[PDB]
Amino acid sequence: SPQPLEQIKLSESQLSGRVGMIEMDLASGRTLTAWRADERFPMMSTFKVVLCGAVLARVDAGDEQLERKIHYRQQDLVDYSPVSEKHLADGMTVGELCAAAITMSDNSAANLLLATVGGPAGLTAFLRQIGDNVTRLDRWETELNEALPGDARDTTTPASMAATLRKLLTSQRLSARSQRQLLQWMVDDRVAGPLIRSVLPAGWFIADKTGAGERGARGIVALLGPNNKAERIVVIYLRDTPASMAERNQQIAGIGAALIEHWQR
Ligand SMILES: OC[C@H]1O[C@H](O[C@H]2[C@H](O)[C@@H](O)[C@H](OCCCCCCC3CCCCC3)O[C@@H]2CO)[C@H](O)[C@@H](O)[C@@H]1O
Ligand SMILES: *C(=O)c1cc2ccccn2c1N[C@@H](C(=O)O)[C@](C)(COC(=O)NCCN)S(=O)O
């Protein structure tokens, strides 16, 4: 593979789209690679990690319990509810809803959670309270994936998302148990996680949340590192490309390959 930055450029060229990328040391926040890191990209399903960070903050404050069972109706369901559609009779705990949102990309679980934190406005208010002055949620699942060109709704920037993930996972804004829980939900992704392991060299740690959207939008927020350690946060977003899903996936994999072969920067 080429150097990370050269590979990122090759991905824009091949996709005819914008790539946004940051690579950041998880422990310290050192930025290693930044490309279009202050430009806006739709978060898509990546927003669910932030969502659950706001949930956990409420649990830490005594305002929520991960045990609390939420009951909902079939009319509450939106497109793609692989776990939540199975619990119309018995409900799901808040903790279970976060597992379903992060690990299975369950959209009704995400909207149920979003209601608990005050909706898109409430989650944006939470972001402002942790010092993220850029990322915004405006809409609910699945409209938030619309990715209209030039539309600021439901966007983050790579730099802002990396800083916010770092804050949620490590800054002691969340309690120790909550930081640990957020991490474990990312480790437990049921879809992209296992496939990524299957192509990662031995000894590479992965935790992640992926997302997709219209007009080629695609992204991943991940923790990655050798020696079975979550050394770096890697955030990669794509937008405004007509390419197939397989090609957007291959390009993202390509950027990862470049990071792996050129790790010690
Ligand atoms: O010299 C380093 C490594 O080079 C190759 O590994 C390849 C691997 O065989 C391939 O499957 C992967 O694809 C990259 C797959 C990454 C998939 C997604 C990565 C995630 C991580 C977070 C950000 C982007 C998405 O690249 C590496 C590096 O060339 C050799 O196979 C391996 O034995 C060797 O240890
Ligand atoms: C966010 O998680 C998300 C947003 C959208 C939008 C449209 C389609 C799918 N998604 C997802 N989820 C997928 C993703 O890649 O993030 C998903 C985890 C896996 O997607 C697929 O492999 N196939 C669906 C076709 N796009 S989820 O299980 O569908």
Side-chain angles (χ1 to χ4, degrees), residues 53 56-57 60 126 167-168 171-176 178-179 182:
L56 292 161
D60 283 354
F126 172 78
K167 284 171 177 164
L168 289 170
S171 68
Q172 301 169 65
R173 284 180 168 81
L174 299 178
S175 72
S178 287
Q179 292 186 148
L182 194 56

Side-chain angles (χ1 to χ4, degrees), residues 32-188:
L32 289 87
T33 307
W35 165 266
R36 297 187 189 287
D38 295 311
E39 297 188 25
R40 294 197 166 272
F41 292 84
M43 285 184 281
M44 301 155 297
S45 328
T46 71
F47 97 93
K48 290 166 186 191
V49 184
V50 170
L51 180 53
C52 291
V55 172
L56 292 161
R58 286 163 38 78
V59 169
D60 283 354
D63 288 324
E64 187 52 278
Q65 301 150 143
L66 286 185
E67 286 90 350
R68 181 176 63 104
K69 191 90 100 143
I70 303 286
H71 294 270
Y72 50 90
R73 292 166 178 79
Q74 189 158 353
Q75 74 200 207
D76 295 323
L77 299 180
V78 299
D79 187 21
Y80 198 67
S81 299
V83 186
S84 51
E85 75 185 15
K86 298 185 161 214
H87 296 105
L88 290 172
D90 62 319
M92 295 179 61
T93 66
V94 169
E96 273 186 315
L97 290 164
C98 268
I102 286 166
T103 79
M104 286 291 289
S105 307
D106 191 299
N107 287 322
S108 298
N111 281 345
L112 288 163
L113 298 164
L114 199 40
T116 70
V117 302
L123 185 54
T124 296
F126 172 78
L127 280 152
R128 294 310 169 256
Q129 291 160 228
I130 68 173
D132 183 337
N133 293 134
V134 176
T135 300
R136 49 187 286 185
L137 196 72
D138 299 86
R139 290 173 291 179
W140 296 76
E141 282 300 353
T142 59
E143 295 70 32
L144 61 81
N145 314 114
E146 197 181 25
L148 290 168
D151 179 1
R153 278 175 306 173
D154 310 305
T155 54
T156 190
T157 67
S160 293
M161 184 54 77
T164 288
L165 288 162
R166 187 166 163 269
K167 284 171 177 164
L168 289 170
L169 289 167
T170 74
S171 68
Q172 301 169 65
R173 284 180 168 81
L174 299 178
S175 72
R177 195 174 190 236
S178 287
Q179 292 186 148
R180 290 167 191 172
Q181 175 67 96
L182 194 56
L183 175 51
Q184 188 64 51
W185 282 325
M186 298 183 66
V187 171
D188 283 349

